């Protein structure tokens, strides 16, 4: 089986084009992930800045919990001023837990973006390696079809065939080309090669979809980070006051117990 009819030549031509288009279309699709890498890196910087900016609030909250733990040890954590202080600070405690949780979610999303991007890249590279080589195999038949005992129409079609598709490929178009070529004896020797090219295309493309979805979830977590970071910073002065007050309460109960022993 060489390509002897115009129909066989055209099905081979279209396939060779689509296989060669795999690397070009996938590079285009891959390049859409760079904006997501930039976004996640930007989230990480913003988180590091928020972590600095909230640290005085966090320090005050730690001081409060330290003093409360000591009041609980003394059996005096039911002191009405302690109770009042704990009420006053509970929203900030809750906001700190949310900041920790949403920042973690942002950072996991960041990790996942890079991982999906690395897989998209490797998928692209495998797809190109396979696609370019399978297209070369087809071109053996196409070039042979320019000469010999095929029809004049077969030879002319082979002469006309360009290396390149005029538009982007896709899972559907590549598969369409492969399926059309299933009818053609000489091309059928490479069927498994064609399959593996398509599988790598799918994998790369799916990884790019995962980058985009992951990055969208990341952004929504980051909005919550930004909201709660501001609430913590805003509470910093009242948290420092609360820490001093409960320290005083705790110190009074310490000295009452010392002086009573």
Author numbering: 37 to 297
Sentences from the study reporting this entry:
Here, we present the structure of T. brucei HpHbR. containing the corresponding region of TbHpHbR (residues 36–299). Ala89, Glu123, Asn124, Asp270 and Ala271 no longer forming hydrogen bonds. hydrophilic residues around the kink site in each of the three helices.
haptoglobin forms a stable complex with a haemoglobin dimer. Trypanosomes take up this HpHb complex but not the individual components.
